[PDB]
């Protein structure tokens, strides 16, 4: 059948870095935007709604605005790559990508946002 896969189902990233999480799906030769729909959620918030070559900026939850986008040219490889920049703590949680391109499937991805070593350091100087 149609099948979405994830190269990795757990990302661990540092507060304030940029992250790119990935979903793969089968594309042959050339992509057909007419047939393609890509969604990204995490928890109870809408990240990406890519329907027929157009990404409706209005459906995006406000905390992801100007800060999370879908990598377009990656799509022609069957890679729906979500890129969040300057990650916050409230970006940790269970993400999910849903893809329709002929068939339809989804997969889940866990993302954790930990503090930098220097923050653990300050906190050990209270020890």
């Amino acid at each position: 059948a149609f099948t979405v896969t994830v190269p990795k189902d757990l990302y661990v990233v540092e507060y304030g870095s940029n992250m790119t999480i990935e979903c793969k799906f089968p594309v042959e030769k050339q992509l057909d935007l007419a047939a393609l729909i890509v969604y990204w959620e995490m928890e109870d918030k809408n990240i990406i709604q890519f329907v027929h070559g157009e990404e409706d900026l209005k459906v995006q939850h406000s905390s992801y605005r100007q800060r999370a986008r879908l990598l377009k040219d990656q799509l022609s490889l069957g890679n729906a790559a979500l890129q969040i920049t300057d990650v916050k703590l409230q970006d940790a949680g269970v993400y999910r990508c849903m893809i329709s391109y002929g068939g339809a499937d989804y997969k889940r991805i866990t993302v954790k946002v930990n503090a930098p070593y220097a923050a653990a350091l300050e906190h050990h100087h209270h020890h």
Partner: peptide, 17 residues
């Protein structure tokens, strides 16, 4: 599937405003 996903996305977008 994608119809359901668009429904839920619509529902949450409404709530958020």
């Amino acid at each position: 599937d994608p119809a359901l996903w668009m429904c839920v996305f619509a529902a949450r977008q409404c709530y958020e405003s």
